[PDB]
């Protein structure tokens, strides 16, 4: 969990956005301006990322629930696979507004969702109508899109790992209102004050995003190793 200071360099973590869209608070992690862009300071970046990795690893050891948030369509797909690979659930694209807090109300939603899935191999064959059938399928699809990937949890998650943060400013606000710790791949235009582990990367290109996902994924497997057995053969 100590990704070479050079691997990210080729990944694209160094290229931010332009000044026209630059959070002035991010100054501590600046290196200059290539073609008037803003090149993140990787040397400043890297200790924080590896530190959060260790933090998230001790979490998974205490068996604290982790979570990830979907972003752009490419990001969402990538997030899903990494999550499913291990555990720690996953959001998809919308975050279903006030999921945290209205977690009891969305819990009833999850209940209804699972029942429908169960009754999707039951109610479908019997009493099927050219009208009701379409109703069932369509509603399930919508519910699944976002609610799917969280339905498993059956409770309040103990951590969150979003991407970019700015695109999900809503998610950080709710997480701050409960104590649930978070991690965010802040970019040159993202308010990081609410984050407890500022990862100054770049939510772009996916390539680099896949690096961050792969990284954390590995740390939570170390947590599972403490939850299963040590390396041997």
């Amino acid at each position: 969990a100590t990704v070479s200071m050079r691997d990210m360099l080729k990944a694209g973590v160094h290229f931010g956005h332009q000044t026209r869209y630059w959070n002035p608070k991010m100054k501590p992690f600046i290196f200059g301006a290539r073609n008037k862009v803003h090149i993140i300071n990787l040397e400043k970046t890297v200790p924080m990322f590896n530190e959060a990795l260790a933090e998230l690893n001790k979490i998974a050891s205490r068996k604290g629930k982790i979570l990830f948030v979907g972003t752009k369509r490419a990001a969402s797909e990538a997030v899903k696979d990494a999550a499913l690979s291990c555990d720690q659930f996953f959001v998809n694209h919308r975050w279903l507004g006030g999921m945290l807090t209205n977690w009891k109300t969305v819990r009833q939603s999850i209940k209804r969702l699972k029942d429908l899935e169960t009754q999707s191999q039951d109610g479908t064959f019997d009493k099927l109508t050219k009208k009701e059938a379409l109703m069932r399928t369509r509603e399930l699809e919508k519910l699944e899109n976002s609610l799917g990937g969280i339905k498993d949890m059956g409770g309040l998650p103990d951590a969150l790992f979003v991407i970019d943060a700015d695109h999900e400013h809503i998610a950080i606000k709710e997480a701050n209102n409960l104590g649930i710790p978070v991690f965010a791949i802040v970019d040159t235009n993202s308010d990081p004050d609410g984050v407890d582990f500022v990862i100054p990367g770049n939510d772009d290109a996916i390539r680099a995003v896949t690096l961050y996902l792969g990284a954390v994924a590995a740390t939570v497997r170390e947590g599972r190793s403490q939850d299963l057995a040590s390396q041997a053969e």
Partner: peptide, 9 residues
Amino acid sequence: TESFAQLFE
């Protein structure tokens, strides 16, 4: 490790 400036150059 090589300096960031030289690497970016």
